[PDB]
Design an enzyme around this catalytic site. Sequence first.
Site, mmCIF file in Angstrom:
data_model
loop_
_atom_site.group_PDB
_atom_site.id
_atom_site.type_symbol
_atom_site.label_atom_id
_atom_site.label_comp_id
_atom_site.label_asym_id
_atom_site.label_seq_id
_atom_site.Cartn_x
_atom_site.Cartn_y
_atom_site.Cartn_z
ATOM 1 C CG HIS A 10 -35.845 20.452 35.446
ATOM 2 N ND1 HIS A 10 -36.833 20.954 36.249
ATOM 3 C CD2 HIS A 10 -35.510 19.243 35.980
ATOM 4 C CE1 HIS A 10 -36.986 20.157 37.259
ATOM 5 N NE2 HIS A 10 -36.336 19.045 37.083
ATOM 6 C CD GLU A 65 -37.320 23.644 33.470
ATOM 7 O OE1 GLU A 65 -37.832 22.593 33.814
ATOM 8 O OE2 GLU A 65 -36.745 24.229 34.417
ATOM 9 N NE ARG A 100 -38.462 17.044 33.956
ATOM 10 C CZ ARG A 100 -39.068 17.925 34.742
ATOM 11 N NH1 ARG A 100 -39.248 19.165 34.359
ATOM 12 N NH2 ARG A 100 -39.592 17.559 35.951
ATOM 13 C CG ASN A 125 -35.839 20.455 41.690
ATOM 14 O OD1 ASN A 125 -35.047 20.483 42.563
ATOM 15 N ND2 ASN A 125 -37.002 21.056 41.703
ATOM 16 N NE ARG A 126 -40.587 15.340 41.022
ATOM 17 C CZ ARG A 126 -40.462 16.665 40.837
ATOM 18 N NH1 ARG A 126 -39.469 17.388 41.378
ATOM 19 N NH2 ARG A 126 -41.388 17.231 40.089
ATOM 20 C CG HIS A 168 -36.981 25.051 38.099
ATOM 21 N ND1 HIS A 168 -36.933 23.740 37.760
ATOM 22 C CD2 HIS A 168 -36.255 25.177 39.218
ATOM 23 C CE1 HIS A 168 -36.233 23.112 38.722
ATOM 24 N NE2 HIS A 168 -35.777 23.971 39.596
ATOM 25 C CE1 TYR A 196 -44.280 24.702 29.892
ATOM 26 C CE2 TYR A 196 -46.146 26.050 30.696
ATOM 27 C CZ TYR A 196 -45.652 24.881 30.116
ATOM 28 O OH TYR A 196 -46.506 23.948 29.606
ATOM 29 C CE1 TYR A 248 -46.209 20.512 39.751
ATOM 30 C CE2 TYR A 248 -45.121 18.386 40.260
ATOM 31 C CZ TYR A 248 -45.118 19.615 39.631
ATOM 32 O OH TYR A 248 -44.051 19.924 38.784
ATOM 33 C CD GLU A 280 -42.823 26.009 38.631
ATOM 34 O OE1 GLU A 280 -42.704 24.992 39.285
ATOM 35 O OE2 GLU A 280 -43.542 25.953 37.609
HETATM 36 ZN ZN LIG Z 1 -37.697 22.855 36.031
#
Ligand SMILES: [Zn+2]
Length: 307
Positions: free
Chosen positions: A69, A72, A127, A144-145, A196, A198, A248, A270
Amino acid sequence: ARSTNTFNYATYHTLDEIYDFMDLLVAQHPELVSKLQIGRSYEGRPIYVLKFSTGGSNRPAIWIDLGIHSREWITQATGVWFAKKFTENYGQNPSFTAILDSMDIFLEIVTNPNGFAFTHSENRLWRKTRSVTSSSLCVGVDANRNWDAGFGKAGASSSPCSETYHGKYANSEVEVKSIVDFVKNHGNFKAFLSIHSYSQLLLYPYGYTTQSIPDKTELNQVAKSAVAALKSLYGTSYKYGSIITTIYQASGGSIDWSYNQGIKYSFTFELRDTGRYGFLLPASQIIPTAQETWLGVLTIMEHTVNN
Ligand SMILES: [Zn+2]
């Protein structure tokens, strides 16, 4: 600029500086560090991996990716710091030295180069990737999906315009598929760390499913240890747990995939902070972030060498 010892690790850098850095490091430590090109980005940029190795066959390896992303920034910054640190710590720190004498480290500093450049050029808070095409005006995928790990399940968006767009199909994004091929080809990855920011979390699988990994006692205790290690420098407080429990539902992630490949030590970090600065973390927190996060990473690496 002219050497890795001259490079300013206390500021954020552009793509060109980071790439030039990779060159300095290889030139400086030819016996330890190799630069690999595992692909090209959507917009044609080389995708680079630094291989740290002391020799051997196809040694068991550690994967580390940062900056998937693009906004970041702290992750790409830590990533340069780590690369230096590996070269510094080899033969100095008995523990790190035992790691590299037996295992290789593959470090991907800018997983998402197109997105990164775009954060410099136009939108600091971008991102996603920068893939185009379809029945949309919207660019880019949440990389990341995009992984084949409950791909397209809840926890990801089927809208192109979404900040969490999963893409057309699992591994649509070249930045993803390049890693996939790479790791599948190698076949001897034992740990897999995605970096990643934060919110100060250490997470293990799953995101996409409520199912408990079989290795959860072990991964939990590992996560506990590494968080303890990390907090020892500056007192920086992480939480830890499975993605789905802590955060989540999230489908198509890095860690779910790698763990499903049989790579047991699959962790996401993170980093700083907790929301005060967010993505726009002060340059003065680069080094302190890098230093503690090292202690957390080292801990896992050690566990890995050990089992
Ligand atoms: Zn990330």
